[PDB]
Each structure stands twice: as structure tokens, then as C-alpha cells.
Design a protein around this ligand. Structure first.
Ligand SMILES: [Mg+2]
Ligand SMILES: [Mg+2]
Ligand SMILES: [Mg+2]
Ligand SMILES: [Mg+2]
Ligand SMILES: [Mg+2]
Ligand SMILES: [Mg+2]
Ligand SMILES: [Mg+2]
Ligand SMILES: [Mg+2]
Ligand SMILES: [Mg+2]
Ligand SMILES: [Mg+2]
Ligand SMILES: [Mg+2]
Ligand SMILES: [Mg+2]
Ligand SMILES: [Mg+2]
Ligand SMILES: [Mg+2]
Ligand SMILES: [Mg+2]
Ligand SMILES: [Mg+2]
Ligand SMILES: [Mg+2]
Ligand SMILES: [Mg+2]
Ligand SMILES: [Mg+2]
Ligand SMILES: [Mg+2]
Ligand SMILES: [Mg+2]
Ligand SMILES: [Mg+2]
Ligand SMILES: [Mg+2]
Lengths: 129, 88, 172, 224
RNA sequence: AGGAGG
RNA sequence: CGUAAAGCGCACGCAGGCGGUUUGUUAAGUCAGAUGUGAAAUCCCCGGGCUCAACCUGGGAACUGCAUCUGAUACUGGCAAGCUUGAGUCUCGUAGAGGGGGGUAGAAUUCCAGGUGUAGCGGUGAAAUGCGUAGAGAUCUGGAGGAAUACCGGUGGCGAAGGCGGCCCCCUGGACGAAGACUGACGCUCAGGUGCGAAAGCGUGGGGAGCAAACAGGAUUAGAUACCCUGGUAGUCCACGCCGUAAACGAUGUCGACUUGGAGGUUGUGCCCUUGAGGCGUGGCUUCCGGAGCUAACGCGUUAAGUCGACCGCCUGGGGAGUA
């Protein structure tokens, strides 16, 4: 059964970028919305919108630069079968800094650089490059 | 395969509404009625393994629903097993 | 673009396999080049236009099509023009000519174990079983004959079962 | 021209919807008669791209190689390019014209020696099994290479019809960087084509429209 | 549906 | 982990692992900070001293830890409420060699009784063994009995797998579709355990037409304890019990999500026009080709061997050995 909606979201985005779909649609969640916020505000997707009040459907618009996809790689790290928690001084680097590591810290979902700014650790939700 | 009238009686005697066909006690009562009915069939058809598989599936579904009921609301579970005569 | 709805109107003119304008803008005694129909230039053989029966009346500009045998078999509109525009005797199969009133040309060759008779000026049907003709007599008319009459007698699979009748009997 | 000429020609035709290479999917409008329909609503602005493009290419007077092989459009191409004095291949694409130009150039230079012979430069010599053997040798060369004999070096722009039917030239051009202009129907895949021209290919009522409208624009990048 | 094929 | 070693034969299922969605609460996990310790030396950094170095030293850092305390509480966990899109029930129908029990039908081989009827039959690459003048073979009539169900028949259907095909009846399991209502995460996987599990085989009691291990004879051959021929017992058949293995194979574990197509097959369901069994959709299962991608390649390719998640099984050179 669906035992990781976050991995489902990342896989949907990965497959959509592979298949050149303009938008990818999925069921919504608080955590999914937060991750979409992070991705949008660091420019890996254009826009996202959640429509529906009983079955909220989230739509993410994917972006491609010179024809190629932008989200060249997107990996789920802290999966249900093996949760990963890191401290502020072992927060990972993605692409040696160019990439991002979406991290759920005690103050919300927010990337590894921002967590190092705010002196927080947390759960490494995913890597994006 | 319970008869339609038997299903209606079970729903009427175990559910709050006559259209309450999905309630946990309604489902467990339906499964118990079918299992009791099928016991006599499998007393005389020992080699009906394919049907025995469906009977075992109903047994396991009833067990799962009973565990759900017990860990959710205990009093309903106890009243149900009292009215149905199931040991546990 | 409902501007191509005036061309959705051009779609109406002629669209499914049926009578079509049949622009013969190009011509040659090799492959009569039909153009109108659906697709662009065509590639049809010849059986009533050139090098076929000897009738040269399709001079560049004649406008007969070929009942659009294919809407488009892939850059290929229609094919052989056996009897496609003036199918005055058959059409679907035979049940519906166009008038059925005047005696149209008919031929009655009997069943040489089958028939293989050009019963109509346009088709050649094989007939099943008895009553091959109208029934004065069944297996005793193997002459092409002449224009006497024409009627229906016994169809079957409604494909190549074109059934003609011309003996001027009680017309059974 | 716009939808007006595009329809009185048939640019709107597309193969059966059971052959359609799915990469065309943006360019189609529907499926009338189990057969696709090419917008002529995106084409017209997109066909305009190549038009105002060959202007630029002929502006530097670069060499424009026309390509067509189907018997349907074989005669369209030859008369269209010579209407502009540009190069064309109306018969089978001799596999290797572009990547193997260092070898194909030998083919031209040998027919260019030959045709001087066959007309005036001492043809009528003995062994009349030799005379015709040139006549069939020259004819075969001229028939497939005589299109581009004066061409010199490699082209700078390459205009084809049926990207599918002629996918060798596209694979040769793309491997040489030369831009590729194509007309791609529903059975083709423009993934090699630089400037696509989406719409019906096989024709002369429609193809002399693509060529005749292109043939001009080369001249007015050449008349300047 | 005779033959094809042959 | 398709073919190199490697998916249990297939299921059910306890413990265990994992868990859809919203609000509230808790602060266990988690994170931050502080305190106490985590001996000295050794490693490392900055220095100092032996003529330099080895060496010896001063100070630091580190000792990834653990215990409290104070905060955050997004995510996981608990707790309490809910929600429905997962899961399940009911209502109507559907198609099917799904299973168990019982009966019966016709064709055919064999045998028995008889009639006609003669010298061959049967067999092979040839032949012989074998059958036949005690009257065979052939043909006809009437019985007996056992087994299997021609045509339909279909890379068709059902089943978890093994498997299941004449017709009829009784009992019975599963799948699926349409519309609605209902319950409200009741779920996915599964070590050990339990059940089912072709064929051969075993035990008891039956049955025994045909076929046929073993066996015998003839032939072939250098030999022929084989292929071929002529016979033939166990066994194939039934009831019950046991075995528990197969190239138990789509050599591809189960569940879920997403990712261009095309041609079919089969089973429902909707619209219109059933206006010619038509198109137009939508579900389920199934066959072939192929795209991106993947693969060592062969190949797979929306029924993935593509992109991911959950759980389980399994592999670690060949032989010895799946043996002791
Ligand atoms: Mg092997
Ligand atoms: Mg292996
Ligand atoms: Mg398996
Ligand atoms: Mg959860
Ligand atoms: Mg120390
Ligand atoms: Mg919570
Ligand atoms: Mg086990
Ligand atoms: Mg057995
Ligand atoms: Mg034994
Ligand atoms: Mg036995
Ligand atoms: Mg026995
Ligand atoms: Mg016997
Ligand atoms: Mg022997
Ligand atoms: Mg034998
Ligand atoms: Mg085994
Ligand atoms: Mg098998
Ligand atoms: Mg198999
Ligand atoms: Mg295996
Ligand atoms: Mg399971
Ligand atoms: Mg199936
Ligand atoms: Mg394939
Ligand atoms: Mg592999
Ligand atoms: Mg052993």
C-alpha cells in the first residue's frame, strides 16, 4: 500500500520531469505543501496550487530550461524503513553546495542552508539537485 | 452465499439502521452466519478445498474485524461476541 | 479556428467513401493521376479512363472520382475505377440500383458448378444454390443473352451475391 | 497563404490515427475519419519561422540543399531549386553525402570529367561496349547526383520533406551541425529537426505550395 | 467458390 | 537475484517491520542550549626544549558517548476526536473446463455368443516373433465392462498455485461491472506455524477396456540387457490415508503509486443513430510489436527487467555437495 506519500510526491515529480509533463497532480498534505513551498521558493518548480476541500488535489508546475529538465535528481533520504535525523553540524551538502537538502526542522520545512543559518538540525526529508 | 432475506434479517437485527449494511457488527454477523451455514456443507464435502479456501478467508476477515472492534470500542465487541457465541 | 468551419463545410462537400469531385489535373497513359477526394495526388490504375477499354474521354480536366475506395490508406485516396461513379446497376451490392424501372442490361449464365457470370454491366457475382436465375428453369441458361429485363431473386452474404433475373416469365 | 492556401491544398491531412508518432501530439487538432488533422493554426506562425529563416541563410548566400525522394514530390523539388539555382536531391539520398563528403566529392568530379567527354571531349571511340557503358554510367550519376554537382563544399541549410522517409539526411545533417528544415507529418518525429514545419508532406498541390513559397524567399534573401 | 497451386 | 550464484511451488497468518488524511494535546524519538562526567598518556592543532629529528613537554581541540535540566515540537510515536480518496459490506446483474457429490449420453478399442465367409492377417526400412484351416482377418447382430469426452476449441475462460475441458442436477468459493447507501485506516508484508500442492510412489479395499515401466520373444548390431516389432505385470481408474517433490517456469516474491503508443482477444457498462451487428466512451483480464528508460548483452518495455516506497526470501568462485 501507499506507505510513503513524500516519496510518492518526489517520484511523481521525477517521472513528470522525465516525461515532459507540464504539471503533475497528486493528493495533498501539510508536509507535501511545505515541501512544495521550499521547492518553489528555491526555484525548482514554478507554482503550486491546492484545489479541493474534501479531496485536496495539489498541482505542481514543472520547469524546463533549455529544453532539459531542471530537477535533474531528487532523492528521498529519510524513508519510513530508515529515518534519518542529522544535527546542525552534520547537515549534508547537495552537489557540494549547489543542490539543496530539504530538511524538516523544529520550526518547519526549510532547506539545509537555512537550517545551518538558524542553528537547527532535523530530519533530512530529501535531496534535490 | 447467504440468501438475500437472511442478509436483510442480519442487517436489521445487528445494525442501527436498516440501511446500515457496513457496520462492523453487521459485517461480523454476516460472516458468522455464512460460516455456520458452511460448516454443514464441509462436514459432507471434506475434499472441497477450493470452497474451504473461501471459508477460511471469511474466518480471517471476521478475526480482523473483531480485533479492530476490540482495540477500538471494547464494550461493543463484548456484546457482539455474546450475541454471536464466539469464544474470542 | 471556425474559419476552418467553412472548411468543415468543405469537409461536408464529399467526405466518406462516396461520389467525389475527382479532379484529373494530371494525366498520362501510364497511371491516370486523380487528385480530388481527401488526400493530395493519387496513384490509381486505369479501367475506364485510358489504355483500358479504348475510350479517351478523360482528357485532362474531366471530373470523375473513384467513390473514395480509401478515405486515406496513408497518402493514398482511392484505387481502380472499375465502376465507382456511374454504378448505375449495383452500388452497395445490387438490392438498390437507382431506378429499377427500365430494363437495365442483364446476362444469365447458369451454374457451371458456381456460375462465374458477369450478370450485371459492372459486377460478376457467384450465386449459391438453386434458383440461380428467376425460375422458369434453373441450370439451362449459359448464354450471355441480351437486354430482356432485370429483377432480384435470392441474395445471401450481401457481398458478391448480385442476383439478376431476365427471362420475362411469370417473374417468380 | 495562411489557412486559405493551406486547406485549398490539404496541409491538414495527417495519417491514420493508428500510425501517429506520438511526438507530434501538440501539433494535432483532432482525428476525423480515424485520421489525424494538423492544426494549420500553429503551423502558419511556425511555417513563418522557416520562411523568415531561409532569408537569413540565403542572405549570406549560403548553399541550400533541397531534399525530396518520393515520386510524388520528386519533380516538385528539382524544378523548385533550379528556379532558385540552389541544390537538390530528387532521387534516392546517396547514403553518405554529408558525413562522407570527402568521398562523395570523388563521385561528382568523375562525372564532371565524364560529361565533357560524353558531349564533345572525344567520346566516339572504339569498343561500342565502352560507349554505352559511359552512357549508363553518366546517366546513373546524373540521375542521383546531378542535382548537386556544382555545389562545391558542404551546405549551410537543408530543407527536406518526410523527415521519416529521408531520416538518413537528417542523421547526416545533425551529425554535421548543419541546420535542418523539415516538414514532419503525424508519422514522423521532429526530434532531429531544428526548424519543423508541421503538416501534410506527400503532395504537389500542397508541396509546390511549401516549395513555391520557400523558393521565393530564398531569392529575396539572394536578390537582397 | 470453381479452381488455385498447376 | 529473467539467462552469470541467487524469488520459497502457492497461499493464509500470529509475533515483528511499515502505515492514508485534519484538528487538538503530550514531549518519548528528534533538535538546540547549559551543567556534570567521558582518568592521564597516545592521535590532531598552536608553541617550547634537547646542535635537528626521533624524543620530552605547555596550552588547546577531540574523546562521535551517557545522565539530568531548560526550550522548539515541523516529522515520527503515544493519546482523543474526527474525514474519506485506501480497506470492507449491502443492493442488481454478468461471464467462466473454479471445486465437491450424484446420474446419464453417444462414438470407439477389447472381450463373449452367434451368422456369412474364405486363406491369409498383423507388422516393418525390410524381416521375424505373434494370430489363423481347431477355421482367423473382414462383415453383421446382441450383450459385458472399463476408461476418456471427437467437432465446439479459440498465445479463448476460470483458479492463489498445482490444475480444471461431454450433458444434466444438488451443495459451494472467487472475480467483475453499473448506481447508491453504509463502516471509517478496520491496511501492506510476514520469520517460526498451518493449509493446499502435477506426476511418479507407498498402505488398505475395490476395479482393470486401452496403454504400459519390469519381463519374454523377434529383429538391428561387433555387442544391443536400447531405439523398432509382437505380447505383457505393476500402474494408470475409484474410496480413504500417506508422501510433499517437478524445467512446481512469464527460470521474473507480494502490495502500492507514477511514466509516450499501436494492433488485437475476452467479459461487462453509457450515449446516441439499432438510422446496415455503427461509431462514440468507460471498467476488468489477457496476446503480440515497440518508444523513453533500463540491461553485460540478449532483451524488458503501463501485465517493466522504467522511476520509487513497505516487508519478506535468497546469493557470495568451481568441484567436493546439496553430499556426509
Ligand atoms: Mg545454468
Ligand atoms: Mg542461475
Ligand atoms: Mg515464483
Ligand atoms: Mg502517517
Ligand atoms: Mg584523554
Ligand atoms: Mg501526532
Ligand atoms: Mg514460512
Ligand atoms: Mg498418482
Ligand atoms: Mg513398489
Ligand atoms: Mg495403489
Ligand atoms: Mg490394489
Ligand atoms: Mg488387464
Ligand atoms: Mg528382449
Ligand atoms: Mg513395447
Ligand atoms: Mg526445489
Ligand atoms: Mg507448470
Ligand atoms: Mg509455462
Ligand atoms: Mg525457481
Ligand atoms: Mg501475504
Ligand atoms: Mg487470470
Ligand atoms: Mg517488447
Ligand atoms: Mg536485470
Ligand atoms: Mg539430503
Amino acid at each position: 500500500s501507499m506507505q510513503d506519500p513524500i516519496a510518492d510526491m518526489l517520484t511523481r515529480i521525477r517521472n513528470g520531469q522525465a516525461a515532459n509533463k507540464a504539471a503533475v497532480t497528486m493528493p495533498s498534505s501539510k508536509l507535501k505543501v511545505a515541501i512544495a513551498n521550499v521547492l518553489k521558493e528555491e526555484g525548482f518548480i514554478e507554482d503550486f496550487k491546492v484545489e479541493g476541500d474534501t479531496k485536496p488535489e495539489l498541482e505542481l508546475t514543472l520547469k524546463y530550461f533549455q529544453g532539459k529538465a531542471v530537477v535533474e535528481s531528487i532523492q528521498r533520504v529519510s524513508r519510513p524503513g530508515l529515518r534519518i535525523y542529522k544535527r546542525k553540524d552534520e547537515l549534508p551538502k547537495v552537489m557540494a553546495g549547489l543542490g539543496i537538502a530539504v530538511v524538516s526542522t523544529s520550526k518547519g520545512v526549510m532547506t539545509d542552508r537555512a537550517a545551518r543559518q538558524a542553528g537547527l538540525g532535523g530530519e533530512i526529508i530529501c535531496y534535490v539537485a | 452465499s447467504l440468501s438475500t432475506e437472511a442478509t436483510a434479517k442480519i442487517v436489521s437485527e445487528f445494525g442501527r439502521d436498516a440501511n446500515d449494511t457496513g457496520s462492523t457488527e453487521v459485517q461480523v454477523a454476516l460472516l458468522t452466519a455464512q460460516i455456520n451455514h458452511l460448516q454443514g456443507h464441509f462436514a459432507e464435502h471434506k475434499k472441497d478445498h477450493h470452497s474451504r479456501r473461501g471459508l477460511l478467508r471469511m474466518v480471517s476477515q471476521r478475526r480482523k474485524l473483531l480485533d479492530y472492534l476490540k482495540r477500538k470500542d471494547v464494550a461493543r465487541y463484548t456484546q457482539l461476541i455474546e450475541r454471536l457465541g464466539l469464544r474470542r | 479556428f471556425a474559419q476552418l468551419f467553412e472548411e468543415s463545410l468543405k469537409e461536408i462537400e464529399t467526405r466518406p467513401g462516396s461520389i467525389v469531385r475527382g479532379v484529373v489535373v494530371a494525366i498520362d497513359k501510364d497511371v491516370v493521376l486523380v487528385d480530388a477526394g481527401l488526400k493530395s495526388e493519387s496513384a490509381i490504375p486505369a479501367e475506364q479512363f485510358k489504355n483500358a477499354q479504348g475510350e479517351l474521354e478523360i482528357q485532362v480536366g474531366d471530373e470523375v472520382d473513384v467513390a473514395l475506395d480509401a478515405v486515406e490508406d496513408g497518402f493514398g485516396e482511392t484505387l481502380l475505377s472499375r465502376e465507382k461513379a456511374k454504378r448505375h446497376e449495383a452500388w452497395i451490392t445490387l438490392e438498390k440500383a437507382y431506378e429499377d424501372a427500365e430494363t437495365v442490361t442483364g446476362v444469365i449464365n447458369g451454374k457451371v458448378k458456381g456460375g462465374f457470370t458477369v450478370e450485371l454491366n459492372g459486377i460478376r457475382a457467384f450465386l449459391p444454390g438453386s434458383l440461380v436465375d428467376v425460375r422458369p428453369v434453373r441450370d439451362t441458361l449459359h448464354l450471355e443473352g441480351k437486354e430482356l429485363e432485370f429483377k432480384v431473386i435470392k441474395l445471401d452474404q450481401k457481398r458478391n451475391n448480385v442476383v439478376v433475373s431476365r427471362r420475362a416469365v411469370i417473374e417468380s | 497563404v495562411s489557412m486559405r492556401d493551406m486547406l485549398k491544398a490539404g496541409v491538414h491531412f495527417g495519417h491514420q490515427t493508428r500510425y501517429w508518432n506520438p511526438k507530434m501530439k501538440p501539433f494535432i487538432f483532432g482525428a476525423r475519419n480515424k485520421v489525424h488533422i494538423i492544426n494549420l493554426e500553429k503551423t502558419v506562425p511556425m511555417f513563418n519561422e522557416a520562411l523568415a529563416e531561409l532569408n537569413k541563410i540565403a542572405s549570406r548566400k549560403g548553399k541550400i540543399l533541397f531534399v525530396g525522394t518520393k515520386r510524388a514530390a520528386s519533380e516538385a523539388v528539382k524544378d523548385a531549386a533550379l528556379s532558385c539555382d540552389q541544390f537538390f536531391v530528387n532521387h534516392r539520398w546517396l547514403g553518405g553525402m554529408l558525413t562522407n563528403w570527402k568521398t562523395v566529392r570523388q563521385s561528382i568530379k568523375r562525372l564532371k570529367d565524364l560529361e565533357t567527354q560524353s558531349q564533345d571531349g572525344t567520346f566516339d571511340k572504339l569498343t561500342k561496349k565502352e560507349a554505352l557503358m559511359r552512357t549508363r554510367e553518366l546517366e546513373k550519376l546524373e540521375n542521383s547526383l546531378g542535382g548537386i554537382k556544382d555545389m562545391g563544399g558542404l551546405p549551410d541549410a537543408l530543407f527536406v520533406i518526410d523527415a521519416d522517409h529521408e531520416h538518413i539526411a537528417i542523421k547526416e545533417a545533425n551529425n554535421l551541425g548543419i541546420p535542418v528544415f523539415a516538414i514532419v507529418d503525424t508519422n514522423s518525429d521532429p526530434d532531429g529537426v531544428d526548424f519543423v514545419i508541421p503538416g501534410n508532406d506527400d503532395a504537389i498541390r500542397a508541396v509546390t505550395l511549401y516549395l513555391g513559397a520557400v523558393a521565393a524567399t530564398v531569392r529575396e534573401g539572394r536578390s537582397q
